[PDB]
């Protein structure tokens, strides 16, 4: 029960609204990332996911609906440029060109299931100066 076309659209809109406000170039969807995202998402592990590749940690992860998950990431803007803002940094980085997101439905024993959301970014986040470079 899944509409891929609308799924890409919603995620792109969330990301690109945030960036458009801030005079940034929009991100384009990349399926490879979206696939990677799903791989991570499927594990049902927010804290300790098993990752692979050079850009393996270049991603955001969050619980519940898309809007809620995205907001929890952008909510960290407050403390930029410290490490707590890294989530928001991924979204807003000037160097960033591509995103791909993926989900999975995970359970709490004898409780309502919840969604796990993951988005991957390319190129990966670097140092403070590089991220704002064009």
Residue numbers in the entry: 31 to 164
What does the paper say about this structure?
We present in this report the structure of MpPR-1i, a SCP/TAPS protein expressed by M. perniciosa during biotrophic stage of WBD, in basidiomes, and in monokaryotic mycelia. MpPR-1 proteins are homologues of plant pathogenesis–related-1 (PR-1) proteins that were first identified over a century ago as important for defense against fungi and parasites. PR-1 proteins are members of the eukaryotic CAP (cysteine-rich secretory protein/antigen 5/pathogenesis related-1) or SCP/TAPS (Sperm-coating protein/Tpx/antigen 5/pathogenesis related-1/Sc7) superfamily of proteins, which has been implicated in biological processes like reproduction, fungal virulence, cellular defense, and immune evasion. Each monomer of MpPR-1i has a conserved alpha-beta-alpha sandwich topology made up of 3 β strands sandwiched between two helical domains, connected by loops.
The structure was refined and extended to higher resolution, using a 2.43 Å native data set. There are seven monomers in the asymmetric unit, which form a pseudo seven fold screw axis when viewed along the diagonal of the cell. The MpPR-1i crystal has very high solvent content, ~70%, which is clearly demonstrated by the solvent channel in the crystal packing viewed along a cell dimension. The main chains of the MpPR-1i monomers are very similar with rmsd ranging between 0.19 Å to 0.27 Å. The most variable regions between the monomers are loop regions, notably the solvent exposed loop connecting the two longest β-stands, as well as the N- and C-termini loops. MpPR-1i forms a unique crystallographic heptamer, which likely does not have any functional relevance as MpPR-1i forms monomers in solution. MpPR-1i, like SmVAL4, lacks the tetrad that binds divalent cations in other SCP/TAPS proteins. This explains why MpPR-1i does not bind Zn2+ used in the crystallization solution. Structural comparisons with tablysin-15, a palmitate binding CAP protein, showed that MpPR-1i has a similar cavity sufficiently large and open to accommodate palmitate or similar lipids. The shortened length of the CBM loop significantly reduces the size of the sterol binding cavity, rendering it barely large enough to accommodate dioxane and definitely too small to accommodate cholesterol.
